[PDB]
Design a protein around this ligand. Structure first.
Ligand SMILES: Nc1ncnc2c1ncn2[C@@H]1O[C@H](COP(=O)(O)OP(=O)(O)O)[C@@H](O)[C@H]1O
Ligand SMILES: Nc1ncnc2c1ncn2[C@@H]1O[C@H](COP(=O)(O)OP(=O)(O)O)[C@@H](O)[C@H]1O
Ligand code: SF4
Ligand code: SF4
Ligand SMILES: [Mg+2]
Ligand SMILES: [Mg+2]
Ligand SMILES: [Mg+2]
Ligand SMILES: [Mg+2]
Ligand SMILES: [Mg+2]
Ligand SMILES: [Mg+2]
Ligand SMILES: [Mg+2]
Ligand SMILES: [Mg+2]
Ligand SMILES: [Mg+2]
Ligand SMILES: [Mg+2]
Ligand SMILES: [Mg+2]
Ligand SMILES: [Mg+2]
Ligand SMILES: [Mg+2]
Ligand SMILES: [Mg+2]
Ligand SMILES: [Mg+2]
Ligand SMILES: [Mg+2]
Ligand SMILES: [Mg+2]
Ligand SMILES: [Mg+2]
Ligand SMILES: [Mg+2]
Ligand SMILES: [Mg+2]
Ligand SMILES: [Mg+2]
Ligand SMILES: [Mg+2]
Lengths: 131, 178, 63, 577
RNA sequence: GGGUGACGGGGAAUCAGGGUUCGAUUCCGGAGAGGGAGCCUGAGAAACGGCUACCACAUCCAAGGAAGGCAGCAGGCGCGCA
RNA sequence: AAACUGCGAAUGGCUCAUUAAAUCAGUUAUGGUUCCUUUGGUCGCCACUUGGAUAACUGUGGUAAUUCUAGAGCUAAUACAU
RNA sequence: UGCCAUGGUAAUCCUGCUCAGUACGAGAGGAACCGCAGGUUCAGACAUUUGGUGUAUGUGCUUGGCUGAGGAGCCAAUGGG
RNA sequence: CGUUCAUAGCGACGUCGCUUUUUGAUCCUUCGAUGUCGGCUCUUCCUAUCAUUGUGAAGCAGAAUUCACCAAGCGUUGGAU
RNA sequence: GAAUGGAUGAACGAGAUUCCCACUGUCCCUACCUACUAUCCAGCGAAACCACAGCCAAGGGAACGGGCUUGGCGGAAUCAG
RNA sequence: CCUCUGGCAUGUUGGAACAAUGUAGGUAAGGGAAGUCGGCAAGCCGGAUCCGUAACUUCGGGAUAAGGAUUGGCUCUAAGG
């Protein structure tokens, strides 16, 4: 019911956020952001809690050389919360996921941003620490 | 805070609920074993001195003196320590204690009344439960009754009658040791 | 509006200001300003920095 | 890995009237095989689920709807703990009762719940899908089940069952409440149990004179008195009031010794949560088969139940996850009996509205309801609204010999046909399956579904709803709640709901009327308050608080003087949203 | 330096005289208690049916925290010809 | 009964992962060391016997939850001291 | 201090919730209007906050040299940070 | 053809047109020189309408949909070679 | 395709390509700062180019007009771009 | 790069501003070649000591291959005639 609010998004298409679930993927090369109409010359960009088509660039060869949906979970670009606190995350990160929002992994290392957890319940359940 | 106040000179102690930050503001940001005046607490406790021996944190974790801060610290403990009973000869264990410093972050405060002022209170200074048993070592018997070595310790000894045994009360007494 | 303490300096941080840092170990730090944040990142021990609270506690200043 | 199970409903299957049938339409039998065996003679039809295709032809042909064919995973065939007959129910696994820990079974009815309770009691020997005690014990090794059964077999453990059906107890025992308790003494703890369950007033009265809630209190008190191990409790909360059902939970938790096994069965989830320390779910196709899950925590087990997804088995058993103008104005009416002084505060009654009634079993929700109807006459004042009204009662008996079809058309033909009613009431309350059965042979939940349908169908302005959640499954409860909502939204006819369940009350409530004061004394019926404020008053009167688990936002119950409780009382937010 | 379908030995199995092979396995010796490390007590331990970390597995939590080690004996799962 | 005190819990049991002059075996050294216990030797102005502390017991508790424990009363020792 | 002829001109589309697993449909599947919460692209602003810049050449720190040293400074096309 | 039914959607054999975002014809203009492909950047116009607004159609139950009308207001992207 | 040399090939190359790591304002998507200009003044002071000149739409015309026809219209003198 | 000896008056002018465009320098959140024909341009790298150094090889090389660590100030010690 409660919608997302925009947040400063510092993962343009080309970024390698590190995979932070137990799949076996190390990296996640972001090849496109989901739900972006866009403009001329503007790279699509995903903040925390965004859906994103990624490719795994290093990790298990089951995962390599194919596209996955994923969710950005942490991000180093500082976003503002409605309560006026800016917040940033030390690393960019994500998790491999399926179209309907379920994790294909099982346990999320490190914290998940609450912008993402509120939006993605199955990620939030596996997430040890939030924000 | 669920203040546990104890008047030691009687042998009676109460659990007093307290709210309103300004009521407790005398206690806050003070160390353990400091003697605070309880006049600001209430006009019932008019001119009362209370030592703050530091009870329990919320989340059940006792204050232990020395650690400072107003948060939890976890320490390696041993035989001869607060907050820890070792279950083996030279057992040693990690347990989380809490700050000496007093804060609203607390379930209980422990207070020991050092001096009562003018007023009295119903379940503390009125009630007078005795020392449960009297002296047992000879020297302490002599010191209680002022005897010296040439005065017979056997006769001037404490003795408790246990009534409602079933048949009749034994005029019972310990074994004087030393 | 829970006023928070700066993880480096010790100054209070009012609602509007400052910045929050969520390290991947899974513990978070507030910073009053960028000066403090930089110091924390360069690994400067605030007990060796004269303007921080921690320094003043250590060296028994005031009182 | 998938297999099939044939099921023949023995009440419906009458081989004489229909002829052979199945055989003639079955393509395996028309080939020339022993897929189905019937004849005009003999009772019940037999089907070989080995030879059966599962074409779904025989079910369409059979005239009564006697046959069913379902698909069950092939993993389960190893772990069958009971099957009574051929072409009948097939139970998989058993719950894992732990000594000195209250087991909480959760799951809808018709999924081998009763058979499990009988097995654990020790009435039914697990036939293990054979249709043996050393062989059964070897089957149950490496688990507390073999411990449990070994305990049963040499030390004769006493199986005692608080029953589901409470209305059948009055027509069996005789004498006063106090006399029966005195007869059944073993522990010699009447007084303490009576003070916990409030049977001070009730000791004098007869068993027939008691209401539903008082009968439950009586039955639980009796079970608490009896010195026995392995306590089976089957829906203790149903018929009870908020504070009564918590007390009943506390008593059952007090019965815990390390000797005794306890096995509660609750459908109010907050009450179950409070009761148990240990939970086991019961998923399957209703009437066809049932699987007892591995034992989870209290919290984890109920989350699994709400998701409809066992993560360990990886079997999504349920499809969907079950997560969370002014018509008239009464003035300040007062109705003094003589010694007792019932009172009302003035307020509004907006159309298309469900007014939830908060209070107690005794504060006279039922008496106010009867007064509003005209079924009770006024001592003072005078509630005489020129309005048609409907009345879903608490106690529901089937003393009208016939079919449910007959009941439906006799009461209300137009609603019974009307599609808007049918999508709203008949379908969601699976009345299409009850329809054919007799009114005599209903279950308790099925009777509650029919009651909901009968009173919704009868035209009115006001709709009184006493205990709709009583006896229904947690799923059915939530359906029944939706049905009432939508019916009223279409009709623009107000309703009033006596519920004692904080799940259902929060679901249904637009506005909420609260009662205050003890029963058989002065009742101060407040004006219709907003939901936010209304529940907080009711919780403050009964001294409870709740919280919400972030995954499903389900209302969990608190302990007295727990930090979370104390914080919530100081804030004034006794629960959330 | 690498390997070992390597714990050592007493011994076992074959055998004319020689040998060939085996010795996880009830006595003796060693080493180890999921993996690595550190230590308290104590005459004796770098103990694991003692603690402290990390890793790897996993359990309740009211999510703030808390506990864990069958290569003891039963027993389970799994692995498998066993 | 409890609780403090003392002793034991380093044996036994399991397994054979490691480990190839290592383990281990026979052989010898400790005139290069430790050793609870056992056994035998030694054991020349409070002493008509000193100090205070604590547990069980009593009673307020805190925590959702552990073989968690805190504060207040007492009271011994071959414990701890002089 | 104002009027206004004439010119110009601007807003856009989407998602989620709800209606609703409802209409419709044998079932599989599966809508819509009113509401509510937000977002895209575009436009016009602005600097409380976060960020960027920084020769206030503000204030430390430091390299090589130069005022005999201390101190106070300067030079190295903005010495570097 | 479209189960049936020429025309919902199509449409053979024939036939009538429009267009200058194809390519040819042509050689009027420029050889005392009109800077010769693409891309980037920026504005504007057209409609022969992909999307969006309002609608008529169906071989439109719903969902998805093609067919047609008013219509050029607003859009119509990021990359690999 | 074989001293019109074929096949090879360490070392070397301001030679021609391709990918990866690092690094970066190349880009998303631009911003701020410095010096010298441009800017204004004193003084000094050129050139190329020039039929006449210098607002448009359409028409016709050597088939893309500043001038012609028919319409729209037209307000001194100048500055930086 | 800084200084003395010696030598100059900033390279055919000055003043006042600190706009846009430029020329020459810098810096940039998050991303990191997505830019472009193309990493063009800039940036990374860099000195020394101590380790450590592959393919291939004409056995010479490759080789500062690659990849690491250290580096200031001060007070001493030892070693070299
Ligand atoms: N003794 C019996 N003989 C034959 N069929 C039975 C018997 N008891 C129950 N059944 C059938 O089994 C079905 C489910 O019964 P049961 O398993 O007891 O209920 P639940 O599934 O709620 O535990 C019923 O529909 C009934 O037809
Ligand atoms: N018509 C009546 N005549 C006499 N007493 C009545 C009548 N109706 C109700 N009562 C009494 O009122 C009491 C409460 O009524 P009831 O509907 O049972 O309320 P509740 O279900 O809350 O107990 C009962 O004990 C009953 O004896
Ligand atoms: S279902 Fe199995 S049994 Fe019933 S008809 Fe088809 S085949 Fe014969
Ligand atoms: S199944 Fe239906 S049809 Fe076949 S016999 Fe039993 S009843 Fe008659
Ligand atoms: Mg582009
Ligand atoms: Mg090996
Ligand atoms: Mg051995
Ligand atoms: Mg060992
Ligand atoms: Mg193991
Ligand atoms: Mg060890
Ligand atoms: Mg063990
Ligand atoms: Mg100086
Ligand atoms: Mg035809
Ligand atoms: Mg030109
Ligand atoms: Mg058109
Ligand atoms: Mg040739
Ligand atoms: Mg050639
Ligand atoms: Mg011209
Ligand atoms: Mg110059
Ligand atoms: Mg000059
Ligand atoms: Mg010159
Ligand atoms: Mg940058
Ligand atoms: Mg490109
Ligand atoms: Mg490119
Ligand atoms: Mg270059
Ligand atoms: Mg090389």
């Amino acid at each position: 019911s409660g919608a997302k609010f925009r947040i400063s998004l510092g993962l343009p298409v080309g970024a390698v956020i590190n995979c932070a679930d137990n799949t076996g993927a190390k990296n996640l090369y972001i090849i496109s952001v989901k739900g972006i109409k866009g403009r001329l010359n503007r790279l699509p960009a995903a903040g925390v809690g965004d859906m994103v088509m990624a490719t795994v660039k290093k990790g298990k060869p089951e995962l390599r050389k194919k596209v996955h949906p994923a969710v950005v979970i942490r991000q180093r670009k500082s976003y503002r919360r409605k309560d006026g606190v800016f917040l940033y995350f030390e690393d960019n990160a994500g998790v491999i996921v399926n179209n309907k929002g379920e994790m294909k992994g099982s346990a999320i290392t490190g914290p998940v941003a609450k912008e993402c957890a509120d939006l993605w319940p199955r990620i939030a359940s596996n997430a040890g620490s939030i924000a | 805070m669920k203040l546990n106040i104890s008047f030691p000179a009687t042998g009676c102690q109460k659990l007093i609920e307290v709210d309103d930050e300004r009521k407790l503001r005398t206690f806050y940001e003070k160390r353990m074993a400091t003697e605070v005046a309880a006049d600001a607490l209430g006009e019932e406790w008019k001119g009362y001195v209370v030592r703050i021996s530091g009870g329990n944190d919320k989340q059940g974790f006792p204050m232990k003196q020395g650690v400072l801060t107003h948060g939890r610290v976890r320490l390696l403990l041993s035989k001869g320590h607060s907050c820890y009973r070792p279950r083996r000869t030279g057992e040693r264990k990690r347990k989380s204690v809490r700050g000496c410093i007093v804060d609203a972050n607390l379930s209980v405060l422990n207070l020991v009344i050092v001096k009562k002022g003018e007023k009295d209170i119903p379940g503390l200074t009125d009630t007078t439960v005795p020392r449960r048993l009297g002296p047992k070592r000879a020297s302490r018997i002599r010191k209680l009754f002022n005897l010296s070595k040439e005065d017979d310790v056997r006769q001037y000894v404490v003795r408790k009658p246990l009534n409602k045994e079933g048949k009749k009360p034994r005029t019972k007494a310990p074994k004087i040791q030393r | 509006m829970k006023v928070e303490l700066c993880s480096f300096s010790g100054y209070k941080i009012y609602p509007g200001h400052g910045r929050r840092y969520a390290r991947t170990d899974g513990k978070v730090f507030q910073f009053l300003n960028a000066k403090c944040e930089s110091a924390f990142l360069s690994k400067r021990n605030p007990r060796q920095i004269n303007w921080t609270v921690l320094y003043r506690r250590k060296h028994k200043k005031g009182q | 890995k998938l297999t099939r199970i044939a099921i023949v409903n023995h009440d419906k299957c009458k081989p004489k009237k229909c002829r052979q049938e199945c055989k003639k339409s079955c393509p395996v039998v028309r080939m020339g095989k022993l897929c189905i065996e019937v004849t005009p003679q003999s009772k019940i039809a037999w089907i070989s689920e080995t030879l059966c295709i599962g074409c779904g032809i025989c079910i369409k042909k059979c005239p009564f709807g006697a046959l069913s064919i379902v698909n069950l995973p092939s993993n389960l065939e190893k772990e069958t703990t009971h099957r009574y007959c051929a072409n009948a129910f097939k139970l998989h696994r058993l719950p894992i009762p732990r000594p000195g820990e209250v087991l909480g079974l959760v799951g809808t009815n018709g999924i081998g719940k009763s058979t499990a309770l009988k097995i654990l009691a020790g009435k039914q020997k697990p036939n293990l899908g054979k249709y043996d005690w050393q062989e059964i014990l070897t089957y149950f090794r490496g688990s507390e089940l073999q411990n449990y059964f070994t305990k049963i077999l040499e030390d004769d453990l006493k199986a005692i069952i608080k029953p589901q059906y409470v209305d059948q107890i009055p027509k069996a025992a005789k004498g006063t409440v106090g006399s029966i308790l005195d007869r059944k003494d073993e522990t010699k703890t009447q007084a303490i149990v009576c003070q916990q369950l409030d049977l001070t007033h009730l000791k004098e009265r007869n068993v027939e004179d008691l209401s539903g809630g008082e009968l439950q209190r009586f039955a639980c008190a009796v079970v608490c008195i009896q010195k026995a191990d392995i306590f089976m409790f089957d829906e203790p909360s149903s018929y009870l009031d908020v504070k009564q059902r918590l007390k009943a939970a506390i008593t059952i938790r007090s019965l815990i010794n390390p000797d005794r096994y306890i096995i509660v069965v609750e459908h109010d989830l907050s009450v179950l949560d409070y009761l148990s320390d240990f939970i086991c779910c019961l998923y399957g196709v209703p009437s066809a088969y049932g699987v007892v899950t591995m034992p989870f925590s209290v919290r984890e087990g109920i989350n699994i139940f709400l998701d409809g997804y066992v993560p360990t088995e990886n079997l999504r058993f349920r499809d969907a996850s079950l997560v969370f103008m002014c018509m008239y104005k009464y003035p300040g009416m007062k109705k003094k009996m003589g010694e007792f002084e019932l009172a009302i505060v003035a307020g509004e009654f907006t159309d298309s509205e469900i007014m939830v009634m908060l209070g107690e079993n005794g504060t006279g929700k039922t008496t106010f309801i009867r007064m509003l109807a005209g079924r009770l006459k006024p001592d003072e004042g005078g509630e005489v609204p020129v309005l048609n009204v409907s009345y879903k009662p608490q106690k529901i008996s089937p003393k009208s010999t016939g079919s449910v079809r007959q009941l439906l058309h006799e009461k209300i033909r137009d609603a019974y046909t009307h599609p808007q009613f049918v999508t709203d009431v008949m379908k969601p309350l699976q009345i299409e399956n009850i329809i054919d059965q007799e009114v005599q042979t209903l279950s308790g939940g099925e009777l509650q579904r029919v009651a909901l349908a009968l009173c919704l169908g009868k035209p009115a302005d006001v709709y009184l709803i006493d205990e709709p959640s009583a006896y229904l499954d947690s799923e059915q409860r939530l359906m029944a709640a939706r049905v009432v909502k939508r019916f009223i939204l279409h009709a623009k006819k107000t309703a009033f709901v006596v519920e004692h369940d904080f799940i259902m009350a929060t679901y249904l409530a637009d506005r909420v009327i609260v009662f205050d004061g003890v029963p058989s004394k002065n009742t101060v019926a407040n004006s219709p308050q907003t939901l936010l404020a209304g529940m907080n008053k009711f919780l403050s009167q009964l001294e409870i608080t709740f919280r919400r688990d972030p995954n499903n936002y389900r209302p969990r119950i608190n302990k007295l003087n727990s930090i979370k409780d104390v914080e919530q009382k100081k804030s004034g937010n006794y629960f959330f949203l």
